[PDB]
From a paper:
We recently identified the Wnt antagonist Notum, a member of the α/β hydrolase superfamily, as a Wnt deacylase that can remove large (C16) palmitoleate lipids from Wnt ligands. Importantly, Wnt acylation is reversible upon the activity of Notum, a secreted carboxylesterase that acts as a feedback inhibitor of Wnt signalling. Stomach-produced ghrelin is a 28 amino acid-secreted peptide with an eight carbon fatty acid covalently linked to the side chain oxygen atom of the third serine residue.
To the best of our knowledge, this is the first reported structure of ghrelin with a cognate deacylase. The lipid tail interacted with I291, F268, F320, and Y129, while the lipid head interacted with G127, W128, A233, and H389. Hydrogen bonds formed between the octanoyl acid and the backbones of G127, W128, and A233 and the side chain of H389. When the peptide was treated with active Notum enzyme, the m/z shifted to 3511.84 with a double-charged peak of 1756.92. In contrast, when the inactive Notum mutant (S232A) enzyme was used, the mass of the untreated peptide was retained.
Author numbering: 86 to 196, 199 to 419, 432 to 451
């Protein structure tokens, strides 16, 4: 039908965690010169014991053995005008997340797991050139959660790749959704034993060495050798980016609260935790005041750009698809939309 069809990478040396071939889903649209490449999320694992436990409970995120042959685009990947009013006719690409490395892993493997997230992106771009990308006018690299952080790490690498390959007319852009995190203090400190409850700084310090991860070169210059973990955090890597990037971020991101050891039950929140949550949104609000193209509602949620109801969230009377359209036209109707109200779900258009 309108579905994206699975393609496995021809270079079988670029694999998922377990050695199965990586791949991508593609839906071609011959009349359009716009391309949407989406990076999937799904946390990470930074040592053998967590990656083994991840392999037993969430096998889809470390292997391609169970991928379906087709997939339906949703949200900004949907081809239905009612669901994607501005970009429904674009070429759609969906890259599944099977490297557990926040799309940072490079180099090859010895014997346990392989971490080739940055090489998977590179190889998809190579193959897509033979399937019509060579004629593109705009390449928008998008992603959610871990894929959103992966956009910040890879958007300038794709730009330089396409220049080196001889396609300087393609305008490369980035869209990072729910990948803008703070290396802050936990609400209640725990020891870095499990994945989702290890502090953000320590998680990336261990991960980048375990994955052989790479960061943008211009950001690596700003921090001491051995402190490359800084470049995994949006407000530190953003000032050195060269491609234009639109930042979508819930002010109270639920994944951010998870690594901060905050667990929301159906109880009434006490003070100090209410203060902690309130202080989080203010610091994230502060990091965005110099980001011209941003969209930050004051909700407690995670991810949105490939959810079907992304057309319903609005900040100051402007929807998310509208803001992306205004940003699109400005590169050839505001684009800086951050909520001013400081408590969660003060925006009436928050999801449920
Ligand atoms: C600074 C690094 C923090 C990365 C946190 C990533 C969280 C995530 O990737 O969330 C996945 C979501 N549950 C599914 O898509
Ligand atoms: C295939 O991938 C491997 C993995 O790193 C790489 O070393 C090699 O150069 C690639 N070859 C081609 C033709 O893409």
């Amino acid at each position: 039908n309108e579905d994206l069809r699975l393609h496995l990478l021809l270079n079988t040396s670029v694999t998922c965690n377990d050695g199965s071939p990586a791949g991508y889903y593609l839906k071609e649209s011959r009349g359009s010169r716009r391309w949407l490449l989406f990076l999937e999320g799904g946390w990470y694992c930074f040592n053998r014991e967590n990656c083994d436990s991840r392999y037993d409970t969430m096998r889809r995120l470390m292997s391609s053995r169970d991928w379906p042959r087709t997939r339906t685009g949703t949200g900004i990947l949907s081809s239905q005008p009612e669901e994607n009013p501005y970009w429904w006719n674009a070429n759609m690409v969906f890259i599944p997340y099977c490297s557990s490395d926040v799309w940072s892993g490079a180099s090859s493997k010895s014997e346990e797991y392989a971490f080739m997230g940055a090489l998977i992106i590179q190889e998809v771009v190579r193959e897509l050139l033979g399937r019509g990308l060579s004629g593109a006018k705009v390449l928008l690299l998008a992603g959610s959660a871990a894929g959103g952080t992966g956009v910040l790490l890879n958007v300038d690498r794709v730009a330089e790749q396409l220049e080196k390959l001889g396609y300087p007319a393609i305008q490369v852009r980035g869209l990072a959704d729910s990948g803008w995190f703070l290396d802050n203090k936990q609400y209640r400190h725990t020891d870095c034993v499990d994945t989702i409850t290890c502090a953000p700084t320590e998680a990336i310090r261990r991960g980048i060495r375990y994955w052989n991860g790479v960061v943008p070169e211009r950001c690596r210059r700003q921090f001491q050798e051995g402190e490359e973990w800084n470049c995994f955090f949006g407000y530190k890597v953003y000032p050195t980016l060269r491609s234009p990037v639109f930042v979508v971020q819930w002010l109270f991101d639920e994944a951010q609260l998870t690594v901060d050891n905050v667990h929301l039950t159906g109880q009434p929140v006490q003070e100090g935790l209410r203060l902690y949550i309130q202080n989080l949104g203010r610091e994230l609000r502060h990091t965005l005041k110099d980001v011209p193209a941003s969209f930050a509602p004051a909700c407690l949620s995670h991810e949105i750009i490939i959810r079907s109801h992304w057309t319903d969230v609005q900040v100051k009377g402007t929807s998310l698809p509208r803001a992306l359209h205004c940003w699109d036209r400005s590169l050839h109707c505001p684009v800086h939309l951050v909520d001013s109200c400081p408590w969660p779900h003060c925006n009436p258009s928050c999801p449920t």
